[PDB]
Structure formats: C-alpha cells, structure tokens
Structure 1
C-alpha cells in the first residue's frame, strides 16, 4: 500500500539514536506526513509573530528538549501537541533522519511521523499563526525564487494563499520527497 511503501522507504534512512547522546543544545522537529486524496502531504506551521526565536517563519512542528522528555522523539511529539493539538495516539514515529548541526553548539533532530486520518489541526495562536499542507510531490518540482539563496513558493489551490518555505525546513522537505517518491512506477 501507499503508506506501507512510505514506511518501508523511510526505515532505510533511519539513523536511530546514533547521535542522540552528544553534548549539544538539543531541538527536535516532527515531519508530519498526512494522506489526502490518495497522495502524501507534509504539514507545516507558520510561527507566531510574538515569539522570541524565529518569529513569522515557516517551520515543522518542534522545539527545544526539556527535562521531562524521555528522548528526542518525545520532544518532537510534545511540541507538536502544544502547537497544533496533535496527540500521541494520532502519530506513528517511523524514523529519525540525519540530524542538522547549527551554530557550532546545537543539534536539531528530525523525526518523520505518519498522521492519523481523523486528525484535525487546532492551531495554538500563542505558538503558531497558521498550519498548512503541501503535497510531497511539490518538492520534486518546486517554484523557486532567489532572494543570494533559494526560496520555495507554494500557492494553496483551495484559497490562493502563497507560502514561502526556506532553509533547513525546505531542505528536509526535499529529502523526504526523494526518499518516498524516487523511482516509483505510475
């Protein structure tokens, strides 16, 4: 099936806990895969304008590890719940992708999660200004704008709203698209 095939692909790139003990400032993100109309989508947030770090920016759900978290995956799930109302029974964490090194002292660990079909996002306005889906296939043929570095523009056909996706977030979206969609029969 589509979902079984995505999970089997993703598992081949799972690094697991290999990098998880290293003495970094630790953040985790959840790459939430949602199946709609027979195709996979990624769920993104727009961060609230009010926040200290990264205001107004398009990010996957996530944030800084805290002492309650059992592990790095727990961080990602906690932050997803606070930001968009995603409960742990509504997500299957499939794998841990390559971590991202930032600022010499920070390690960001991405986890890919399969999202239950009955999940309905409840944006928390203290954390997130918007939540939106992009079809995974988009990241194979994105609409690129050079601001000099590359920015993706995605226009939702439901309402014509354009979103700008860039940086680590854009890079991770492309990675997941390649993993799941490369070399597939039609």
Structure 2
C-alpha cells in the first residue's frame, strides 16, 4: 500500500535515540504526513507573531522539551496537540530523522508521523496563525525564489502563497526524497 511503502522507506533512515541524551537545549518537531486524494502531503504551521521563537515563519509543529516529556517524540506530540489539536491517538510516529544542530547549543529532533484521516486541524491562535498542507511531490519540483533559497507554494484551493525556508524547507525535501524516490507510476 502507499502508506506501508512510505513507512517501510522511513524506517530505513531512523536514527532512533542515538543522539537523544546529548546535553543540548532540546527541541522536537513533528513532520506530519497526511494522505488526501491518493497522495501524501506535509502539514505546516505559520507561527503567531506573538511568539519568541520564529514569529510569523512557516514551521513544523514542535517546541522545547519540558520535564514532563518521556522522550523527544513526546515533546513533538505535546507541542502538536497544543498548536493544532492533534491528539496522540491520531498520530503514528514512524521514525526519528537526522537531528538539526543550531546556535552551537541547540538540537532539534525531527519525528515523522502518519496522521489519521479523521484529524481536522484546530489552529490555536495564541501559537499558530495558519495551518496548511503541501503535497509531498511539490518538494521535488519546487518554485524557488532567492533572497539564499526560498520555496513559494500556492494553494490551488484558494490562491494563497506561502514561503517555506531554512530547516523546514530542508526537512520537507528530505522526506520527499525518502518516500518518493525510485517509484513506479
């Protein structure tokens, strides 16, 4: 199946807990895969302007680990629930991808999760100004604009254009390569 295939691909890139104990300022993000109209999509947020970290940016759901979190995956899930209403039972965490080192003292750990088809986003306006989907295939042939490289994605449902950049754009490309490379049509 499309989903069994995607999960099988993703598991080959799982680093698991290999980097999880290192003494960093720790953040997790959830890369949420959603199947619609027979294709995979990634779910993104636009962060509220009110935030301290990345205000107004296109980001995956996520945030800073807190003492309650059993592990780095729990961080991702807690933060996704708080931001977009995603409950734990609505997500299957498939793997942990390469972590992203920033600012010399920070480690961001990305988790890919498959999202239940009955999930409907409920954007929390204190955290998120918008929640949107991009087809995963877009990241193989993106519309690039140079400021460094920025992707522009125009939702054909409404004509709205989103700018995706930095680590968020880099992860979206990685996931697209992992899942979509070398497939029969």
- TM-score tier, shorter chain, comes to over 0.9
Measured in 1, the distance between the counterparts of 2:180 and 2:59 equals 22
Aligned-residue offset at 1:6: 0.1
Q: Deviations over 1:91-136 (max 9, x none)?
A: 0000000000001000000000000000000000000000000000
Separation of aligned partners in 2, 1:88 and 1:105: 29
| In 1: Cα distance, 2:55 partner to 2:170 partner | 19
TM superposition shift of 1:141? 0.1
CA distance in 1, matches of 2:126, 2:66: 19
Length, aligned pairs only? 185
What displacement does 1:2 show? Answer: 0.1
Gaps in structure 1 of 5+ consecutive residues: none
RMSD, aligned CA: 0.2
> Which residue does 1:70 correspond to in 2?
70
CA distance in 1, matches of 2:122, 2:145: 31
Query: Within 1, Cα distance between the matches of 2:55 and 2:108?
Result: 18
Counterparts of 1:55 and 1:69, CA distance in 2: 24
- 1:27 deviates by 0.1
Supply the distance in 1 between the matched residues of 2:73 and 2:152 (Cα, whole angstroms).
29
Deviation at 1:53, TM superposition (A): 1.3
> Could you list the per-position Cα deviations for residues 79-101 of structure 1 after superposition, in whole angstroms to 9, with x for gaps in the alignment?
00000000000000000000000
Whole-Å Cα distance in 2 between the matches of residues 27 and 60 of structure 1? 12
Moved over 3 A (4+): none
Task: Report the TM-score, using the length of structure 2 for normalisation.
Answer: 1.00
* SS of match in other structure, 1:14: coil
Q: 2:150 aligns to what SS in structure 1?
A: strand
What secondary structure is seen at the aligned counterpart in 2 of 1:35?
strand
Deviation readout 1:159-178 (Å, 9 max, x if unpaired): 00000000000000000000
